[PDB]
Every structure is written in structure tokens, then in C-alpha cells.
Amino acid sequence: PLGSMVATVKRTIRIKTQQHILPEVPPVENFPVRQWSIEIVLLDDEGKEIPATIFDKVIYHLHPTFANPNRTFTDPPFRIEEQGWGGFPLDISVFLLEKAGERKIPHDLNFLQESYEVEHVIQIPLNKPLLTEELAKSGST
């Protein structure tokens, strides 16, 4: 990194998606309606999943066809459950502890697998004591 970005650490997030058809919901234009879920975990320096306590809030910014498309969750693993008929790209806003910053994590909600996981690297500052202490749980700081 350069400049102010030197004072950061990288962490890997894993976005975990699951989906299945709901037969009791009438297909929309012959397309089945599916229940789907997204959860977010943190990986440590060994690759083990641990609670993503470095975020005090996650907002899923859903496709505009959803009612109340901006859904806020405050407790790991920030699980969202919805229903729909089509996949879409979405930004997941994760808010670091101590107002350290919003990160927009690009996700794609799709039906290509019953469940699938995607890892994303984010850069996190080291100037908020409580966040730094929390970061120690998932690796070097």
C-alpha cells in the first residue's frame, strides 16, 4: 500500500449462501420461487471460520424488486433470509467497529449451487483500539 493505506491489515471474509425451491409458492412466469440465505463469517490466519465481530452492522442492499430492499443486521453471522425467483449482484455493506469505515463487498446471489461460499479480502485500519483488539482474534495485527 501507499500512504495512509500502509496503516491497515488485510482480513478474509467468507460469504456463505444457501438456496432451495419453495414448491408451495406459485412459480413466477414458470420460474420457481426459492428461499435463500446469506451469512458472513471471518477467517482466521489458519482458515478457520470465526464470528465476524469486527463488524457492528451489515446492510444487504437487495435488488429493487424486494420490499424494504436495505436490510440491516447487527449480530454475527448477520444472516439474511429472503425469497425470490432470480439471481442478482448486490453490494453488502459491512461497517467496521468504532466507526472505522464502511466496506462494500460485492456478492452475487444466484442459484447455480444449493450452497456456495465466496471469500473477499478487506483492508481494515489499525487506529481504533477496540477494533485492533478485536482483530487480534483472527490473526496478526
Binding site: 420460474f31 435488488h63 432470480g86 439471481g87 442478482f88 444466484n110 442459484f111 449451487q113
Partner: peptide, 5 residues
Amino acid sequence: QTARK
């Protein structure tokens, strides 16, 4: 499985 919005 390839359905998109």
C-alpha cells in the same frame, strides 16, 4: 439454476 433478475 441460471435464472437472473
